[PDB]
RNA sequence: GUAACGGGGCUAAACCAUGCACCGAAGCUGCGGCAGCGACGCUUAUGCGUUGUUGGGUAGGGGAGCGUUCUGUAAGCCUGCGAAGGUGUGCUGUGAGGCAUGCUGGAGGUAUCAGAAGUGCGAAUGCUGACAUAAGUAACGAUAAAGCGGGUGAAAAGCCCGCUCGCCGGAAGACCAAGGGUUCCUGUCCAACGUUAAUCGGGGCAGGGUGAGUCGACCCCUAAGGCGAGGCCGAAAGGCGU
RNA sequence: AGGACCGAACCGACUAAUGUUGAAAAAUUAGCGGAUGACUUGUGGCUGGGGGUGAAAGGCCAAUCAAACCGGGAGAUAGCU
RNA sequence: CCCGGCGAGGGGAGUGAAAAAGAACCUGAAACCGUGUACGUACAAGCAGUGGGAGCACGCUUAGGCGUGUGACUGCGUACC
RNA sequence: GGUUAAGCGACUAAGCGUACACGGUGGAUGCCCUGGCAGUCAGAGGCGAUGAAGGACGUGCUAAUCUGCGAUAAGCGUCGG
């Protein structure tokens, strides 16, 4: 089962109208280190909710 | 003024990079850097390197201030396609296209 | 004497594609489709050069009928009355008067009614 | 349907899952903190925490059960001689999952899972 | 699947080698044709 | 699926008769324009003065042209004060077209009247290249299976180290022949190749590495068979054979 | 003893499923037949295209076979498309 | 010099008449793919045009209105070979 | 002026279209010629057991390839320029 007609660049764009990525709405800010991090994840410098949880 | 950074012949289809590029079009560069930092795409890494290169071009070549810069232009063009053979069943060959893209990021304060 | 036919072929395709602007999709960018669409546009343009005269006469007749019925007479009896009164005003002018000079159109309707009476 | 069912398949057959969580429980016991994938850490809770609970009582039979479940005598020793006493008064919840982002090679969602008292 | 090319250097040289071609009138014609066409490798001879 | 008025609707908005209106085509008329063929008087390179009339068209016949490359005209003319080509725009002709000019371009172009053709593309499941589409879809090649810690790294699910786990174990281990031919080892690099990432590699690059009286080959010897002095045979080529 | 029997290697290929842009231009998996013989296999050799070879299917003769392949006559011819 | 991995790629600087001549290099067309702007488009059925045509946008103009772009709505309209 | 009611109603663009601007891809076009093509005139019409045609290997300050050359090896002697 293959197309009988070449679908248009318009239908291609129409189908891709749902492909847009969602940006992360907002980053959270660690209360201790003040550096931005993904919500409920550890900071890239090992903090989490103001506590240092890992030494990396 | 406007400062450009290009990553030409990036190894990724422009369609994939364009998702990320649309994600940070028109944003302030700090906000764009955050968005790219948390966007789980290979294209986000490439676009982030281009954006950081653009910011450094602006601050160094054009004496801009990072806090003023916005991503005023972030198109992704198609670059040349590398052409490769995928052997398929029954002796058939397909040619796959390893599509490259050119990423252009323009930052400016205006 | 070999002739490279690239320049003239480019020019012909460009002529057609310049005529094909505004057309949807391949019709405005793909020469095969564009040429078909340009030809069909030409046949429509001819056929409709004809169709325009009758569409506009149709519009005028409808407007005259409307105005004449505002003056208590059908279009048919109005046109017959105008002929019997020897008034030779086109449907175009009659409709234009019906819209823009309702008093003069009323006068025309009286003239036709006198002719018919 | 999987109404009310528990336990993640994790795209492994059962004996692979059991082997993997035995190894992962041993890793967590001996290192007290391990990076793994978030679903794997959430399932690892359900194996490690019962091992610690079991080790809160030090009998020969309980060391035998622990050894059956861990197959590592160093892990059993650390469970009964350190972890059991370290969690003697803690009513469950011996681990902590800390989401730590996404693994580069496959974008996998990653978490740290640690013993709760790993600080001291 | 056994495939049709089962290499053997000895059989290759005996069937298409330089000496085999020089052995007959038609082999020498093959060589003459290949020289005239200018081929870098006249024969299978490695 | 109403589905036997095109529909709505209609008791006329049906039917019959009569009558006058009107609508209605690219028919006809009007106005403007072009062309063909006639007939007329002045004549000519026919202009016209007019004047009738004709002008749907496939196969096809006839007539007249546009434009492209090349030759002459041309050691001329245009051209770095910007050629060709490209891309716009404007104007222009009945058309093929033509002219001008903005931008690009950066060195060629070429009137006129002749001359010659690889002289005009949308089709030929045409040919070559490029690029789409399906679509970021299928798939990523045995369902032996991974987990974690440490290292290195810009980055590690995949590399290195470690500890577990699993799988083969008349093999999925080991040594070879054949075949390949540097894939070997070390260093280094990660564009491309690796169906992912790769710091890794049978990838790139460089350097290194193959040591024989006894292993093998060569060699001595013969099989099948080949070739074959002479020879026999065969137009020739050559066949057969001592 | 045996073209004996059961059954691995080895040789095959009866059934089914899968696969059919395959992992694969004939395989995989589960079964299946032969398995001291008219067996099987390595290496080399010989047979050449109206020819070979064939426990015979027009089978096979380099994924090609009611006349191989390559080159040539050759721009065969094509009242057909 | 700068970003970047002592990358790739790029931004400056400089060379040059020219670097949008930078080696993926004269000219750089088309398909094809984007970014920006203008207009339209989420109650509307079909070769996608054509005839009519509102509205908007822009550019001219000394008004006056013309150019342009778009094109709601509407009559007609089933590609080419 | 306020409320209610009724009627009408712009502003949305996930995307998409058309136009335009600017790009990308691509490599057409034009321009170019140390390559071909066809000849004319004229030479020469052979090379080889004094080892040919064609090659293999080697040969440099040389890693490769090409050209040359041949262990006297990008060359040696001599005669001339
Ligand atoms: Mg194959
Ligand atoms: Mg899975
Ligand atoms: Mg009419
Ligand atoms: Mg006619
Ligand atoms: Mg020219
Ligand atoms: Mg045609
Ligand atoms: Mg699909
Ligand atoms: Mg899938
Ligand atoms: Mg695999
Ligand atoms: Mg690790
Ligand atoms: Mg190699
Ligand atoms: Mg190795
Ligand atoms: Mg890769
Ligand atoms: Mg290697
Ligand atoms: Mg010795
Ligand atoms: Mg003899
Ligand atoms: Mg038997
Ligand atoms: Mg058989
Ligand atoms: Mg089987
Ligand atoms: Mg039996
Ligand atoms: Mg025959
Ligand atoms: Mg033919």
Curated annotation (Swiss-Prot), chain A:
Record's keyword terms, sorted: Ribonucleoprotein, Ribosomal protein
Region (Disordered): 1-37
Subunit-level organization: Part of the 50S ribosomal subunit. Contacts L17.
Annotated family: Belongs to the bacterial ribosomal protein bL32 family.
GO molecular function: structural constituent of ribosome
Protein name from the UniProt record: Large ribosomal subunit protein bL32
Entry's Gene Ontology cellular component terms: cytoplasm; cytosol; cytosolic large ribosomal subunit
Lineage of producing organism: Bacteria, Pseudomonadati, Pseudomonadota, Gammaproteobacteria, Enterobacterales
InterPro entries in UniProt: Ribosomal_bL32 (IPR002677), Ribosomal_bL32_bact (IPR044957), Ribosomal_zn-bd (IPR011332)
GO terms, biological process: cytoplasmic translation; response to radiation; response to reactive oxygen species; ribosomal large subunit assembly
Pfam families recorded: Ribosomal_L32p
Organism the protein comes from: Escherichia coli (strain K12)
UniProtKB/Swiss-Prot annotation, chain B:
The UniProt record lists the keyword Transport: no
Keywords (A to Z) from UniProt: Antibiotic resistance, Ribonucleoprotein, Ribosomal protein, RNA-binding, rRNA-binding
GO biological process: assembly of large subunit precursor of preribosome; cytoplasmic translation; cytosolic ribosome assembly; response to antibiotic; ribosome assembly; translation
Family as reported in the entry's similarity comment: Belongs to the universal ribosomal protein uL22 family.
Pfam families: Ribosomal_L22
Protein known as: Large ribosomal subunit protein uL22
Effect of residue 91 to A/D/S: Abolishes translation elongation arrest of SecM
GO cellular component: cytoplasm; cytosol; cytosolic large ribosomal subunit; large ribosomal subunit
Disulphide-bridged cysteine pairs: none
Swiss-Prot record, chain C:
Keyword Signal among record annotations: no
A single BP term in Gene Ontology: ribosomal large subunit assembly
A cellular component annotation (GO) from this entry: cytosol
Spans traversing the lipid bilayer: none
Role noted for this protein: One of the primary rRNA binding proteins, it binds close to the 5'-end of the 23S rRNA. It is important during the early stages of 50S assembly.
PANTHER family named in the record: 39S RIBOSOMAL PROTEIN L20
Family: Belongs to the bacterial ribosomal protein bL20 family.
Record protein name field: Large ribosomal subunit protein bL20
Gene name tied to this protein: rplT
From Swiss-Prot, chain D:
Keywords per UniProt: Ribonucleoprotein, Ribosomal protein
One Pfam short name: Ribosomal_L17
Coiled coil: none
Entry keyword Transmembrane: no
InterPro entries: Ribosomal_bL17, Ribosomal_bL17_CS, Ribosomal_bL17_sf
UniProt keyword Ribosomal protein, yes or no: yes
Top-level taxon of the source organism: Bacteria
Gene Ontology molecular function: structural constituent of ribosome
One Gene Ontology CC term in the entry: cytoplasm
Gene Ontology biological-process entries: cytoplasmic translation; ribosomal large subunit assembly
Family as reported in the entry's similarity comment: Belongs to the bacterial ribosomal protein bL17 family.
NCBIfam families (UniProt xref): L17
Assembly with partners or alone: Part of the 50S ribosomal subunit. Contacts protein L32.
Function: Requires L15 for assembly into the 50S subunit.
Protein name: Large ribosomal subunit protein bL17
Organism expressing this protein natively: Escherichia coli (strain K12)
Native organism taxonomy: Bacteria, Pseudomonadati, Pseudomonadota, Gammaproteobacteria, Enterobacterales
